């Protein structure tokens, strides 16, 4: 992961947008991929921490441009773009800022009940429209096939951990993968466009109207299992919990809720493995150490 001063951020934009004068810079936020900077208190600029992050930034810019007026909520609108180099697919992107604060579980549970329920209904309508966006014109590259991903994760873990685990420990790893791959329910779904990081940090809230006023952070968006967009909201202290998501599910007219629960239960066991892989692919080593300790 690399880093920026405000000076570098300024000169970068100046190169490509010399007519855009900058008055104020502050850090808005940071994900796994980019630092986000708030320019003119009315524009969010994302600069990539590494080549992987930049590839995700490029994804996000491209998908946003295809869905920009298809959804019932505000999403980030692309106003400025950087350029490709040998290191980054896209050096930066600037977006219109969405005013609001994250809909944290704490905030959500302090709302009046009718507001909490409007939030579930508004999140369901958003998912329902997102999952219906026609995907013909999307890059076949964005398809994430879960069965494929799981087979590739199995090889990656073997090859990462082969000198770190004892043979009986790796055999149990292989058994875990095998059991997952024999269960069809994880792999039979109809691909559609999914947000794929759909959780409280990315759901913006207007505390004067007590209503959701935006969805942000489309860097992980893919064509994949729509159920991903529910399971990411379900974890208890950290996210919303099953009662709230079951309201979303009902508005969405989900027909197979026990399948969503079973996917969530498996994603919960799967976390240690993702920590190891995401660890290395993002070079965050504290995650790697953690998943490995867990696996033992």
Q: Is there a contact between 223 and 143 (Cβ–Cβ < 8 Å)?
A: yes
Using alpha carbons only, how large is the chain's radius of gyration in Å? Answer: 20
Is residue 153 part of an annotated ligand binding site?
Answer: no
- Among 60, 82, 88, 97, the residue binding ligand GMP under the rule CB under 6 A is 97
Q: Does 93 bind ligand GMP (CB under 6 A)?
A: no
Q: Does 107 bind ligand GMP (CB under 6 A)?
A: no
- Among 48, 53, 82, 100, the residue binding ligand GMP under the rule CB under 6 A is 100
The two structure tokens encoding residue 240: 């919303």
Is residue 227 part of an annotated ligand binding site?
Answer: no
Backbone angles phi, psi at 257, to 5 degrees: -60, -35
Is residue 220 part of an annotated ligand binding site?
Answer: yes
Minimum distance of ligand GMP from residue 194's CB (angstroms) = 18
Q: Does 9 bind ligand GMP (CB under 6 A)?
A: no
- Among 12, 16, 22, 29, the residue binding ligand GMP under the rule CB under 6 A is 29
Q: How many angstroms separate the Cα of 128 from the Cα of each of 97, 123, 192?
A: 24, 8, 11
Other C-beta atoms closer than 10 Å to the C-beta of 74 total: 16
Residues binding ligand GMP: number (CB under 6 A): 15
Q: Does 241 bind ligand GMP (CB under 6 A)?
A: no
**CB under 6 A: which stretch of 28-36, 65-73, 171-179, 276-284 binds ligand GMP?**
28-36
- Among 44, 73, 108, 173, the residue binding ligand GMP under the rule CB under 6 A is 44
- Among 4, 43, 56, 76, the residue binding ligand GMP under the rule CB under 6 A is 76
* Among the listed residues 60, 14, 9, the one whose alpha carbon sits nearest the alpha carbon of residue 38: 9
Minimum distance of ligand GMP from residue 205's CB (angstroms) = 10
Q: By three-state DSSP, how is residue 205 classified?
A: strand
Give first-to-last CA distance, the chain, whole Å. 28
What's the rounded Cα separation, in Å, for the pair 139 and 61?
13
The two structure tokens encoding residue 38: 């708030």
Q: Does 28 bind ligand GMP (CB under 6 A)?
A: yes
What's the rounded Cα separation, in Å, for the pair 293 and 218?
31
Minimum distance of ligand GMP from residue 5's CB (angstroms) = 18
Map the footprint of ligand GMP across residues 255-284, applying CB under 6 A.
Answer: none
Q: By three-state DSSP, how is residue 255 classified?
A: coil
Q: Does 165 bind ligand GMP (CB under 6 A)?
A: no
Check the CA dihedral 258-261-263-266 and report its sign: negative
Task: Write out the residues near ligand GMP by the rule CB under 6 A.
Answer: 28-31, 36, 44, 76, 97-98, 100, 201-202, 204, 216-217
Going by the annotation, the residues of the binding site for guanosine are 98, 217
């Amino acid at each position: 992961m690399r880093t920026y001063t405000f000076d570098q951020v300024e000169k970068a934009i100046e190169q490509l947008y010399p007519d855009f004068t900058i008055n104020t810079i502050e850090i808005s936020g940071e994900g796994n991929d980019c630092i986000a900077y708030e320019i003119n208190r009315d524009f969010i600029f994302k600069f990539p921490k590494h080549s992987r992050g930049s590839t995700n930034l490029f994804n996000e810019v491209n998908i946003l441009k295809r869905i920009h007026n298809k959804l019932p909520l505000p999403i980030p609108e692309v106003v400025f773009t950087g350029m490709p180099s040998e290191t980054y697919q896209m050096s930066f992107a600037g977006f219109t800022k969405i005013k609001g604060v994250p809909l944290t579980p704490l905030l959500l549970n302090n709302l009046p009940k009718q507001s909490q329920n409007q939030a579930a209904k508004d999140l369901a309508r958003f998912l329902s429209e997102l999952h219906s966006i026609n995907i013909s014109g999307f890059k076949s590259n964005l398809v994430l096939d879960f069965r494929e991903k799981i087979n590739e994760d199995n090889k990656k873990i073997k090859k990462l951990l082969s000198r770190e685990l004892k043979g009986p420990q790796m055999k149990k790893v292989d058994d875990f993968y095998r059991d997952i791959l024999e269960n069809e329910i994880y792999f039979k779904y109809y691909p559609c466009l999914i947000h794929n990081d759909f959780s409280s940090d990315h759901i913006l809230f207007d505390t004067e109207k007590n209503t959701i006023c935006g969805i942000i952070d489309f860097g992980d968006a893919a064509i994949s299992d729509p159920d991903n967009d529910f399971i990411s909201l379900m974890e208890d202290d950290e996210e919303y919990g099953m009662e709230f998501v079951s309201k979303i599910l009902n508005h969405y007219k989900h027909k197979d809720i026990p399948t969503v629960l079973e996917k969530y239960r498996m994603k919960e066991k799967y976390w240690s493995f993702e920590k190891i892989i995401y660890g290395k692919e993002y070079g965050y080593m504290d995650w790697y150490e953690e998943g490995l300790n867990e696996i033992r």
